[PDB]
Design a protein around this nucleic acid. Structure first.
Lengths: 120, 259, 255, 56
RNA sequence: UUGUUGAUUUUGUGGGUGGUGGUGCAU
C-alpha cells in the first residue's frame, strides 16, 4: 500500500463523514480554528504564495498539523470528490483542488495508521 | 432566561410579526440566526403566531444564514409544524400560498429539507392531503439528482404507506438520472410485494398510486435494469398487476433493453 | 340600492383607512425597534450561551457519497403505440400538405398575400471552416470519397450543445458546404464518376440535415450565388454557366 | 468578483510566520475564522451582519 | 453562485409536463 493509495481511501472516508474542508478558504478557516488534523497540499500551484501561507499556518507552534505533498491539483480534487463519474465510470469534469484539509477521520482504518506512522 | 430588556424588545418583535404583511422586518428579528440561542429567542417571538408572510421571510432569512445542521431544527420545529397546522385547521384542508412558498425555499437546502420535512412527516403519520401538497412542492422545484436519489432510497426502504408511495411516485416522475444502486433499490421495493416465504406486503391490497409509480418506473428506467431484474418485475405484475395499468407496465418493461 | 352602495363604499373606505392606520402604527413600532437595536443586541451578546448525529442522519451521508461514486442511469420517455405514432405522423403530414396548398394559392409567411407584395413594385482538433477555402485546406490531403467523412466529423465536433456559438459555426458551415458541393461538380470527375457519385450525393444529404436547422444561413448563401452567377452571366454569358450551376439549381429544388 | 481574496487576508514573512491583517468577529456563533470587512468608518461581519467601530 | 456562502446555483443547447382545477357518477 503506497502512501498515495493510503490517502485516497482516507480522503474518501473523510468525505463520508463531512470531515474535509475543500478549498483554500475552507482550509485556512479550519487551520485557524484548530480543527485541522491533516493538510494535503499541491506541488504545482502556480502562485508561490499559496504554498508559503498554507505551510506557515500548518507549522504554527500552537497547532502543528502534518503536511503532505501532492504532485497535481487535479488528482487531489478527484480524491476530494469534486469530480463526476461517467457512464464508463471514469471521473469527468474534475475540478482541481489546490488544498484539502481533514477535520474528521470518520472511521479508524489501517491506512490512517500508516500515514500517522509515516509522520511520526 | 434572556435579559429582561431583551425579552421586552422581542415581545415587541412578536407583536409586529403577528400582523406583518409587507415592508422591512424588524432589525432585531433579522439578526436571530446569528445568535447561538436562536431557539430561545425564536420562542419569545411566538413562531405559531407568525403571519404567513413572516413564515416566508423568516424561512428566507434562516436557511440561508444558519448552518445545514442548525437549519434542520428551524425546518423541523417551526415550518413543518406550521405546515401541518395550517392544513389541519383550514376549512378546505388547503395550504396557504406563503407557507407553500416557504416550503420551496427550504428545499433550497436539500439535506435539511429532506430531514426536516419529508422524512419526519412520512414517519409521523403523514396523511394523503399532506403528501399531495408536499409532493407538489417537490414536483415543481428542481432538486439535485444526488440528494433526491438518496431520498428516494429512503422512502423505498420504509414500510409501505400510501402517503409515502406518493413521494416515491413524485421523485420517479421527476425523471432524474438515478444511480444504478437507486434503480436496484427501486426494483427491490417493487420486488417485496410479490407472493413467494414473504412478509405480509405480498398480500397487501395495492392502491392505484402504487401502480402509477410502478408505471413511471417502467416508463423511465426500463433501459437501466438487468434481465434478471426485468423478469422478477414481470412476475410482480403477473401476481399483483392492476386490471388496466398492468398491461402497460408489461408493455413498457418488455420493450426495454438490459443494461 | 344607491344608499346600500354608498354604505358599501363608505365601509370600504373606512376599512381602507383602518388598514392604513395599522400600517402607520407598525412602521413607527419598527422604527422605534431599530433605534433600540444596539442596546438589545449588546445585552444579548453578553448572555450568549457558552459552546451525536442520529442513525437516520448517519445513513443519509453514507448513501449520498455512495451515490456520488455510483454511475447514473440515462432517462427514457414512455413509448408511444404504433397507432398513436401513425396518427401523429398522419396529422403532421396533413398539416404540412395543407400549408403547401395555402402557400401555392398565394399565402406568404412573413400570413400575408401575394397582392400585398404587388403594391409599389411597378412604380419603382477538428476545425470548422467559416469559408469555402478553409474547408479545402482541411480536406486538401484527403481523397474524393473522404469528403463526407470529414464533413460529418466537423458537424459532430461542433454540435450546438457542446459549446456556445456552435449554432452559428454550423450555420456558416451550411453555406460553406453548399459551395463545396457546387465546387466539386465544377471539377473534372470523368475519371472517378463512381467515387464522385458516392461523395456528391452524400454531401447533399448532409446539407439537407444542415438546411433543416440552418435554412436561413443556407438561404442567404443561395441568394448570393444567384446574384454572383447573374453578374458572371453579365460579363461571360454562357461561359459563366458551368456544370456547378446546373447542379446548384437542382439542390434548391431538393432543399 | 475578487480573485484570491483569501491570500490578501493574511501575510507571510520570509521565516514562514503568518500574521492576520484583519480582525476576526467576536460573535460566539461566528467564532474564529470569520474576518470582518474593513470599511472607512466601520468593521462589518458578512455572517452576523454586526457592525464594529474601526478603533474599538 | 448565495446572503459572508460553498456547488444548493449560473450560462448555452434540447426537452416532458395542463394540475394544492373543478364538476357530477358508481360502497
Amino acid at each position: 500500500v503506497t502512501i498515495e493509495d493510503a490517502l485516497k481511501v482516507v480522503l474518501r472516508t473523510a468525505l463520508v463523514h463531512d470531515g474535509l474542508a475543500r478549498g483554500l478558504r475552507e482550509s485556512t478557516k479550519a487551520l485557524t480554528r484548530g480543527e485541522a488534523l491533516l493538510v494535503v497540499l499541491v506541488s504545482s500551484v502556480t502562485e508561490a504564495n499559496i504554498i508559503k501561507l498554507v505551510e506557515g499556518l500548518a507549522n504554527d507552534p500552537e497547532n502543528k498539523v502534518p503536511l503532505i505533498k501532492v504532485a497535481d491539483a487535479k488528482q487531489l480534487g478527484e480524491w476530494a470528490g469534486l469530480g463526476k463519474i461517467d457512464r464508463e465510470g471514469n471521473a469527468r469534469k474534475v475540478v482541481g483542488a489546490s488544498v484539502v484539509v481533514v477535520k474528521n477521520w470518520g472511521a479508524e482504518t489501517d491506512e490512517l495508521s500508516m500515514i500517522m506512522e509515516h509522520f511520526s | 432566561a434572556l435579559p429582561e430588556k431583551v425579552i421586552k424588545a422581542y415581545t415587541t418583535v412578536g407583536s409586529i410579526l403577528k400582523t406583518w404583511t409587507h415592508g422591512k422586518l424588524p432589525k432585531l428579528f433579522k439578526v436571530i440566526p446569528s445568535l447561538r440561542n436562536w431557539q430561545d429567542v425564536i420562542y419569545v417571538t411566538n413562531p405559531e403566531e407568525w403571519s404567513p408572510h413572516v413564515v416566508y421571510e423568516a424561512t428566507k432569512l434562516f436557511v440561508s444564514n444558519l448552518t445545514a445542521k442548525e437549519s434542520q431544527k428551524f425546518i423541523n420545529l417551526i415550518l413543518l409544524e406550521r405546515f401541518r397546522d395550517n392544513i389541519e385547521t383550514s376549512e378546505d384542508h388547503s395550504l396557504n400560498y406563503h407557507i407553500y412558498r416557504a416550503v420551496k425555499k427550504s428545499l433550497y437546502k436539500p439535506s435539511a429539507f429532506f430531514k426536516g420535512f419529508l422524512f419526519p412527516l412520512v414517519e409521523t403519520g403523514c396523511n394523503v392531503r399532506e403528501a399531495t401538497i408536499a409532493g407538489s412542492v417537490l414536483a415543481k422545484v428542481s432538486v439535485p439528482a444526488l440528494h433526491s436519489s438518496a431520498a428516494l432510497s429512503y422512502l423505498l426502504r420504509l414500510p409501505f404507506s400510501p402517503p409515502t408511495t406518493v413521494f416515491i411516485k413524485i421523485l420517479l416522475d421527476k425523471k432524474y438520472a438515478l444511480p444504478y444502486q437507486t434503480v436496484d433499490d427501486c426494483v427491490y421495493y417493487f420486488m417485496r410485494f410479490r407472493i413467494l416465504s414473504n412478509g405480509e406486503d405480498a398480500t397487501r391490497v395495492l392502491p392505484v398510486i402504487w401502480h402509477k409509480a410502478f408505471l413511471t418506473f417502467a416508463q423511465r428506467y426500463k433501459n437501466d435494469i438487468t434481465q434478471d431484474q426485468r423478469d422478477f418485475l414481470l412476475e410482480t405484475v403477473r401476481q399483483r398487476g392492476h386490471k388496466d395499468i398492468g398491461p402497460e407496465i408489461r408493455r413498457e418493461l418488455l420493450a426495454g433493453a438490459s443494461r | 340600492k344607491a344608499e346600500v352602495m354608498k354604505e358599501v363604499i363608505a365601509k370600504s373606505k373606512f376599512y381602507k383607512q383602518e388598514r392604513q392606520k395599522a400600517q402607520g402604527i407598525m412602521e413607527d413600532q419598527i422604527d422605534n425597534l431599530d433605534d433600540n437595536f444596539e442596546d438589545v443586541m449588546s445585552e444579548l451578546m453578553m448572555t450568549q450561551p457558552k459552546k451525536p448525529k442520529t442513525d437516520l442522519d448517519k445513513e443519509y451521508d453514507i448513501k449520498v457519497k455512495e451515490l456520488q461514486l455510483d454511475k447514473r442511469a440515462a432517462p427514457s420517455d414512455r413509448t408511444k403505440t404504433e397507432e398513436e405514432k401513425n396518427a401523429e405522423a398522419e396529422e403532421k403530414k396533413r398539416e404540412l400538405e395543407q400549408q403547401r396548398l395555402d402557400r401555392m394559392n398565394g399565402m406568404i409567411e412573413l400570413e400575408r398575400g401575394v397582392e400585398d407584395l404587388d403594391d409599389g413594385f411597378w412604380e419603382n482538433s477538428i476545425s470548422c471552416p467559416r469559408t469555402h477555402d478553409a474547408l479545402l485546406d482541411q480536406v486538401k490531403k484527403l481523397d474524393l470519397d473522404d469528403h463526407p467523412k470529414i464533413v460529418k466529423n466537423i458537424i459532430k465536433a461542433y454540435q450546438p450543445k457542446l459549446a456556445e456559438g456552435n449554432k452559428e459555426k454550423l450555420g456558416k458551415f451550411t453555406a460553406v458546404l453548399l459551395r463545396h458541393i457546387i465546387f466539386l461538380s465544377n471539377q473534372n470527375y470523368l475519371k472517378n464518376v463512381q467515387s464522385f457519385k458516392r461523395t456528391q450525393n452524400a454531401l447533399i444529404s448532409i446539407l439537407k440535415s444542415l438546411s433543416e436547422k440552418y435554412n436561413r444561413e443556407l438561404s442567404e448563401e443561395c441568394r448570393d450565388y444567384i446574384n454572383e452567377m447573374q453578374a458572371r452571366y453579365k460579363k461571360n454569358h454562357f461561359d459563366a454557366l458551368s456544370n456547378g450551376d446546373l447542379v446548384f439549381f437542382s439542390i434548391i429544388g431538393i432543399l | 468578483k475578487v480573485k484570491l481574496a483569501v491570500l490578501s487576508y493574511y501575510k507571510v514573512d520570509a521565516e514562514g510566520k503568518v500574521t492576520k491583517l484583519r480582525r476576526e468577529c467576536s460573535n460566539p456563533t461566528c467564532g474564529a475564522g470569520v474576518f470582518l470587512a474593513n470599511h472607512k468608518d466601520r468593521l462589518y461581519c458578512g455572517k452576523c451582519h454586526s457592525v464594529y467601530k474601526v478603533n474599538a
